[PDB]
Design a protein around this nucleic acid. Structure first.
Lengths: 393, 386
DNA sequence: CTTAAATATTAGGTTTTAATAACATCTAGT
DNA sequence: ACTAGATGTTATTAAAACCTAATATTTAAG
């Protein structure tokens, strides 16, 4: 079988012979002779996976998934190339590629490939709550990990668990034991894990309330990667670190995330909601509100446009719609915050804080608090509910 | 020839009635095994409680002396040694436990090897020699076979989850424990059952489920004759009451004091708990310690003086405390005392600050109560308790 | 004090699993 | 294409976990 990327490159090369020298620079090669091999010989892989990733990202950016899915799924799993494809798929959250590779690699006869798949299955199972952190780290001990790559990914997938649930305390200690410099086989994996650490470092500094460091680590992330997923969330993170303090710089960062995600439905919508919510927080005319949606979040942000602009009747219509819907803890907290501003009623604001606490939200909880501050309450106490790290001597 | 055997021989010569009584204490149908125990070096009982309950009944004031001699002489390749292990940890007899560990880790018995190795992980983990990631990784590589150690691997994590104060994944991890899967070693089963009650009480403590917390502490007290679990069950029940019911609180602290009379450390804990309880409730305080210059005892002098309007005498104490190294939890108290003494709300805000900096959802009531006295929004400082 | 039945413990012999390295393949670049 | 260098496979050995047999020890009735 010939892979789509090889068919593509053959056709493009026929219509443009200058491509071979240019692909060879994109691929890190000293001259393009491996690139003949690659096109003509089934099974030919390059020593590092970034050679085919950067060629795909440069010649066919709009088709990366289609070609990489076809490429990875015909890789012999016993090879370094395919180990590389596992991290590739996980990093971009291509779970249909990731999980097919994993099950092939777990029963394959190559000890490295088996080890890679096996800890990667653990990370999927843990992050889908099919097993427990306790069960998962046990299986990690039981595998008797040999490769530096999985040594480092075993601590990474835990940090990805701590982050999801919420337990931020031991992360700064756990991540500091990661030592990527011990990796010597797979520079693709090393360089992505380096991006991964930057992102994790960024989020840790976010919750330690060290926002300028948060922004530096996300900057380091962006400079370290060409992977949309990581780029997307570094801009998200940066903007959130600025959402309540610097309107124009947060909007600048959200728009940059919006621009690079025009073609990705999930990622474009994330920045749409963020811009909408940003502009509501700052009481601005809001081009981002979605009047054709009956989700809770979209509906909530309408009530916010309205309450912001003294359209009190029209905000009542939306909250009446909301009253009929399945609210969870964090969504009710927003409800109460909205109901509070509409009825100017401190008691809602209190319930708002209450359900933000219950849903362990140290971020949107600024909304009820600011409102109470504008109504004569004791700012010193309001600060203590938003329990921010203070950095004393 | 072990001391406890010697003591038993002598007391038997002077009271021949003891053989039948020891046998019921030990759960034997008849005391013929007790003869063997006295006549033959190396005789052990099917169940470790037999000798523990005897020792507790006839020699309650020499339990450490006699059990240390008895354990440290067992054959570590044996179920009496395994039992002796848990016994050692459960009473916090670390000099017994640790010696037992080094010898079972390299002994030829597969089962003792396994026990010794998961208790090494537990000591190392709780002494901060390894991390919990490293610890759990090793429990995986042991490929634990015995139900006993399957249960204790979850337990030693739950204690670390306590010491640090991760507190949250506790309630799902402890539910995974299934003590009924233990068939070999009933002593270990029953003390692990006490352990779970104790842990369940502390879980329900940090969910402010105080009536359930007192229930689990109760079930612990009924399930055990180990002074450790009894001391901390009574302390736990008092603290659960310390801000709502002065009398029932004191009654539990007093009860804890009476069983701890011969133990220096357990006695101090209860003197300090009574001292702080009465300072909380602004009573005359017969439990102050005027010779101790520890931060905690000095703090409570300041607290008593402030209670009784001797502000000048409490400033003398606070000046002495001003030049001693405070951690976050200690500093919180200091800001509490300074705020009461000075009638200064900013000191209370700071105290709430340093109370949340050590994740103390207990003693933080002190500043919150003072600000409610001073006119602040009760709905607001209700929220500070979450 | 014996001792038989039940329970624990130790060992002999087996299968699995894992570490070593000798051999073979594949890659990059002349 | 073909060579050095870097990776993959396989043959050979150690080993370590794993049962089933035998041996010891415990309880409680003689």
């Amino acid at each position: 079988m010939m892979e789509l990327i090889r068919i593509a490159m053959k056709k493009d090369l026929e219509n443009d012979n200058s491509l071979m020298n240019k692909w060879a620079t994109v691929a890190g090669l000293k001259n393009p002779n491996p690139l003949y091999d690659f096109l003509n010989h089934d099974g030919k892989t390059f020593n590092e996976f970034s050679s085919i990733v950067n060629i795909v990202k440069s010649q066919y950016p709009d088709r990366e998934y289609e070609l990489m899915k076809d490429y990875c799924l015909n890789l012999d799993v016993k090879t370094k190339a395919a180990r590389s494809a596992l991290e590739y798929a996980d990093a971009n959250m291509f779970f249909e590629i990731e999980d097919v590779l994993i099950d092939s690699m777990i029963s394959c006869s190559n000890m490295k490939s088996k080890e890679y798949g096996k800890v990667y299955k653990i990370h999927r199972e843990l992050s889908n709550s099919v097993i427990t952190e306790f069960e998962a780290v046990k299986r990690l001990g039981k595998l008797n990990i040999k490769t530096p790559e999985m040594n480092s990914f075993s601590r990474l997938l835990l940090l990805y668990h701590y982050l999801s649930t919420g337990n931020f305390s031991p992360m700064a200690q756990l991540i500091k034991q990661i030592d990527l410099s011990e990796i010597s086989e797979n520079m693709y994996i090393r360089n992505t894990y380096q991006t991964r650490v930057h992102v994790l470092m960024s989020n840790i500094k976010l919750n330690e309330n060290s926002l300028e460091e948060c922004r530096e680590y996300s900057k380091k992330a962006l400079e370290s990667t060409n992977i949309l997923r990581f780029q997307v969330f570094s801009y998200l993170t940066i903007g959130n670190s600025l959402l309540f303090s610097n309107y124009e710089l947060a909007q600048e960062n959200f728009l940059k995330g919006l621009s690079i995600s025009v073609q990705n439905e999930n990622y474009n919508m994330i920045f749409q909601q963020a811009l909408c919510f940003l502009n509501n927080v700052w009481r601005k005319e809001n081009k981002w509100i979605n009047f054709e949606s009956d989700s809770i979040m979209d509906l909530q942000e309408q009530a916010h446009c309205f309450i912001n602009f003294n359209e009190n009747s029209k905000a009542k219509e939306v909250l009446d719609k909301l009253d009929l819907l399945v609210h969870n803890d964090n969504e009710l907290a927003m409800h109460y915050y909205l109901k509070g501003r509409l009825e100017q009623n401190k008691a809602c604001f209190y319930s708002s804080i209450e359900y933000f606490k219950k849903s362990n939200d140290k971020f949107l909880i600024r909304l009820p608090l600011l409102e109470l501050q504008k109504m004569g309450e004791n700012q010193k106490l309001l600060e203590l509910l938003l329990l921010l790290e203070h950095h004393h001597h």
